Amino acid sequence: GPVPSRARVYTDVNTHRPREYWDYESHVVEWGNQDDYQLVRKLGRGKYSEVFEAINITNNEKVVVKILKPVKKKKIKREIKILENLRGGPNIITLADIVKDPVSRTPALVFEHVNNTDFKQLYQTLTDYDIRFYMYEILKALDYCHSMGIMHRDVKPHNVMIDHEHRKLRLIDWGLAEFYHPGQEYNVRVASRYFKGPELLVDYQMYDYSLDMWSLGCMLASMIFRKEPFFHGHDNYDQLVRIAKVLGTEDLYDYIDKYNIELDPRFNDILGRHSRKRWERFVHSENQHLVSPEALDFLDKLLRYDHQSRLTAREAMEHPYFYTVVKDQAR
Ligand SMILES: Cc1cnc2c(S(=O)(=O)N3CCC(CCNCc4ccc(-c5ccccc5)c(Cl)c4)CC3)cccc2c1
Numbered sequence: 001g002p003v004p005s006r007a008r009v010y011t012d013v014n015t016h017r018p019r020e021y022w023d024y025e026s027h028v029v030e031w032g033n034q035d036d037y038q039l040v041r042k043l044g045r046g047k048y049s050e051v052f053e054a055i056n057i058t059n060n061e062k063v064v065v066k067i068l069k070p071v072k073k074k075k076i077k078r079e080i081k082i083l084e085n086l087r088g089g090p091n092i093i094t095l096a097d098i099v100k101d102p103v104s105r106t107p108a109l110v111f112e113h114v115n116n117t118d119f120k121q122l123y124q125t126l127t128d129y130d131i132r133f134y135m136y137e138i139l140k141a142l143d144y145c146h147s148m149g150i151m152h153r154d155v156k157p158h159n160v161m162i163d164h165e166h167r168k169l170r171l172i173d174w175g176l177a178e179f180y181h182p183g184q185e186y187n188v189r190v191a192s193r194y195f196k197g198p199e200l201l202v203d204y205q206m207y208d209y210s211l212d213m214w215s216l217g218c219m220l221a222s223m224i225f226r227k228e229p230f231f232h233g234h235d236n237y238d239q240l241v242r243i244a245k246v247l248g249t250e251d252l253y254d255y256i257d258k259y260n261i262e263l264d265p266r267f268n269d270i271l272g273r274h275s276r277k278r279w280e281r282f283v284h285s286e287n288q289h290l291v292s293p294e295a296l297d298f299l300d301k302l303l304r305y306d307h308q309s310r311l312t313a314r315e316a317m318e319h320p321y322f323y324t325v326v327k328d329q330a331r
Helices: 073-086 119-123 128-147 210-225 236-247 249-258 265-271 293-302 313-317 320-329
Strands: 037-045 049-056 061-068 095-100 107-112 160-163 168-171
Touching (some): 037 061, 073 095, 128 160, 128 210, 128 313, 128 320, 210 293, 236 265, 293 313, 313 320
Antiparallel strands (some): 037 049, 061 107, 160 168
């Protein structure tokens, strides 16, 4: 059976909190008054929610309403508790209220007003500096939630809002997030395929905050190399193959050995043998303006098989890739 693993940081943060902090099954939702909010316009739709701009009529505040599609009550409680625990954190969406929808009977989360810039208009105009800046802003949200004992587990472009006009950013969709407890075995069937860590793909359940750092690395690769998604698997198996064709099979098998992970002998044959590639082979005339030695060094230190060897959020924030942004922020 597999060798156990622990977060290198924020290991015991939840153990030191009152049980109610993380024991979301005990949480009692006190519903607000639905009549306080009038929907104004639809902003977007997901498979799990509909998002609207609304107005709080009690006081004339602009608000955003996320009307949840039916999900298991446990997972709704989890997301609410996490949002409440993280309220006020840097670049975390701020949950103002919780109301039941009259029509669908389903829950509606009410947030402090947030703006999204149509990314497509930005994508073609995003500088090397901009990427460093926004990556730093994401890292502030991740360091915060990790420090608060919470893994996002679904880091991806769709879960990152920017308001480019005001240089503002928000990490959204906390629906897959979970509390970190040392020893706990988590469901590996989380995150979008392109951003799943190797730990998920090889079925190592005793994972931690460092999952988010892999996903972040996948995002960084897609941005600097202009290749979205960067690791484009067509299935969960091929996802790991795409990774292995870049990082190499030697380090993959070293990881599996270190943690005594049992992998299907079939998987071993379809994985094959691949050299570790230099990152330079993915630089081309279109993307080279986004790529620096510092960007590649940083990327290298996120995208490791061994979850324990990846940078933490706080370490990442100290990395040379961010030096001029930090200096400039401290204007
Ligand atoms: C709570 C809530 C829920 N939804 C809301 C909606 S929505 O549902 O319509 N909405 C969902 C979110 C989606 C995100 C677009 N992300 C683009 C992006 C951003 C940053 C990066 C990036 C990272 C690192 C370095 C450089 C760039 C990249 Cl690569 C891409 C837009 C659409 C609108 C308004 C307010 C809402 C409020």
